[PDB]
Amino acid sequence: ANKPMQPITSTANKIVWSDPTRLSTTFSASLLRQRVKVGIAELNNVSGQYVSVYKRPAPKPEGCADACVIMPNENQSIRTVISGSAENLATLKAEWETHKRNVDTLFASGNAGLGFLDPTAAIVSSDTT
Amino acid sequence: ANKPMQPITSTANKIVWSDPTRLSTTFSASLLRQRVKVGIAELNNVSGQYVSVYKRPAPKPEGCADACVIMPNENQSIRTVISGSAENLATLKAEWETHKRNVDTLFASGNAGLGFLDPTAAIVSSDTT
Amino acid sequence: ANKPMQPITSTANKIVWSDPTRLSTTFSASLLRQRVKVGIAELNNVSGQYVSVYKRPAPKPEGCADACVIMPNENQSIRTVISGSAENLATLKAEWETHKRNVDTLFASGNAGLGFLDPTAAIVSSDTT
Amino acid sequence: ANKPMQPITSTANKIVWSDPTRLSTTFSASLLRQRVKVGIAELNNVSGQYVSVYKRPAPKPEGCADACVIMPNENQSIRTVISGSAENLATLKAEWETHKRNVDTLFASGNAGLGFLDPTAAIVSSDTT
Amino acid sequence: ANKPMQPITSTANKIVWSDPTRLSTTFSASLLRQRVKVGIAELNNVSGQYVSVYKRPAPKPEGCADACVIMPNENQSIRTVISGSAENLATLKAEWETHKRNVDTLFASGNAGLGFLDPTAAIVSSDTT
Amino acid sequence: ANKPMQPITSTANKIVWSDPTRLSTTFSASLLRQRVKVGIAELNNVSGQYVSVYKRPAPKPEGCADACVIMPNENQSIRTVISGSAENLATLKAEWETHKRNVDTLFASGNAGLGFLDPTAAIVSSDTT
């Protein structure tokens, strides 16, 4: 039962969501729209920036914690920027699924979080054979 | 059967994979490690930058019976940056799952890709009730 | 039945051959001779430069049913330079056989043409065991 | 039984192979990749440079050799550079076969090594009749 | 079951490995190759620098297990430099076996930690009787 | 039956051993002990420098045994420096065993003489799983 997050600031192109029970937890979405004529037509490319923030205490008192020791804070941040013409949103969504998959391979079940790279990792395109 | 991608360039901190049948398709992973230790503690931060690129041709003219017609490409880019201490990797992974979930709500099954924001979207924390 | 090529320009040191049905196709041979004799010995060096050129049209758009369609060309160049004393021509020829063999391993039946290097490739000297 | 050669230096784009039993024998491969839009599309042209080196003593004590006379050294070098778009690697390989054939005609069984040119040599294109 | 170590920083001539669980544990290998000049001889010496590091905790107090660990790690370092021409590598390996043996006698089973130099120690050459 | 070596020069902190049959073969051990300062800790680090030397003859010519030997010996050197506090000597010994093992992998059975750095080498920590 993941806790509902309510937006606290709103923009035509920007909403920032912050947890009510833990204000410092935020998720923000900012959209950028520009007209680019790649092949004589103003393609409607869109640049969406999505940012997650959690304030993560890292006492790392190993062995044990005992009283309220002023929590010390660390910032856990994840930012994604998706850029693509609207006209091809369908394939852009396919790219998002594949990108998640590839990141998962290295970070979710690999050691990329632990700052390690597996040059043999099974990375794939969105295209099929 | 997603097509496998091969490392083309390689560095200890950074690898670029590419589709050998389509070189315009890349996935790159770049990691930077720094020790930003807090007072009376030790702290190592691991910033990982993950970038997906696809060169997509513009949507074919829809009202088309022309035999073969391919115009020029469309740049589709997705970048994720994950920043967090190694010590809390376990919870950082939980944040990644939640972040994907929240992006999916807006982008995957919402209208954020079309430049539209839903202020009633069900956004959630990684923490449970 | 490979098409015969004719000398078009000619010099004592250098000849250019071309396909009379396709002038964009050339093979040229240029030779320079110098006497770089070592102390208490005589030494003549023969540097030979061999260049192949083909102008190739870009791969036809693959998904094509258009009746006739040829776009512009692609420059394909191969240059070999052989440098060695005339006195040791016999072993220099052996080096040429081995060099061809080693290039073939990587390029002809390997992935070097695709920008890929195989560090386990079976590379060999002209000398025998 | 040609002697196996083990690479001693490695690069993302460069491996140098040197014989273990005769270090001064090397074969190196260096790849260069550039994007060129010949006809509005970034063709993936690749420039592979392949170099063979042998250190060839040339005492040329004719009639006879008798004791260890400090060997004197000559450098036998062969360099090939292959440049072509990846998209047409198939025909680029055909050009390599033809180039070898044409070089063989002049150098392997002609007198081009001996610094002589046969203007009547049977030179051919990769194209067929 | 000794913990595997991965290469965190890599160059053609230097790799640094670091343990996944504990980063401050490192092993690095750095090698430089240069041409050596001798009368009537041309060989290439290879210099290799090998460094092991551990941030070991201060040896623990006695009778008192603190509530939580507060070890003031010290830098434990071992550096080896091996210098010799690739030409005589076989005998250079024999020197390494013997050097290890001699160091063992003083340090591994002698007062190496104490630093006392037992002058009756059984030290031996790599040469045999 | 390795040849015994005797101490030709001795100080409280440095001994030099040299073979009876061949003097130019040396092994020296030099140790310095100093007080180390850590927060709430007083330990004494011991630095030991161990150097092996051989004046190996140039590798021999081929096919020709001169009337009398005229080898132009080269300096084959190996230096190890072990640094750590006497307090944690037990774990410092474990580091030495592991450092030897890791060097063996690259140098003893890898391209150590060649100087090539195999980036897939199985390097391990002294810590166990």
Core attributes:
RNA bacteriophage, alpha+beta, 47% strand, 129 residues, 6 chains, part of a larger assembly, virus like particle
Description:
This is part of a larger assembly, with six copies of chain A (129 residues). Chain A has 129 residues and is of the alpha+beta class. Chain A is 16% helix and 47% strand. Chain A is built from one helix and six strands, in the order βββββαβ. Chain A has a five-stranded antiparallel β-sheet with strand order 1-2-3-4-5, with helices on one face. Chain A is flat, with a radius of gyration of 20 Å. Chains B and D meet through β2 of B and loops of D. β1 of chain E pairs antiparallel with β7 of chain F, so a sheet runs across the interface.
Detail the topology: elements first, then pairings:
This is part of a larger assembly, with six copies of chain A (129 residues).
Chain A: E1 2-10, E2 14-18, E3 26-37, E4 42-57, E5 73-85, H1 89-108, E6 124-128
Antiparallel strand pairs in A: 1-2, 2-3, 3-4, 4-5
Biggest chain contact: E-F, 81 and 81 residues
Largest sheet of chain A: 5 strands, antiparallel
SS class of chain A = alpha+beta
* Anisotropy-based shape of chain A: flat
Q: Roughly how much helix do the residues of chain A carry, as a percent range?
A: 10-25%
The N- and C-terminal alpha carbons of chain A lie at a distance of 39 Å
| Extended strand count of chain A | 6
Task: Round the Cα radius of gyration of chain A to an integer and report it.
Answer: 20 Å
Protein name (chains A, B, C, D, E, F): Coat protein
Keywords (chains A, B, C, D, E, F): Capsid protein, Virion
Domain AP205 coat protein (chains A, B, C, D, E, F): 15-129
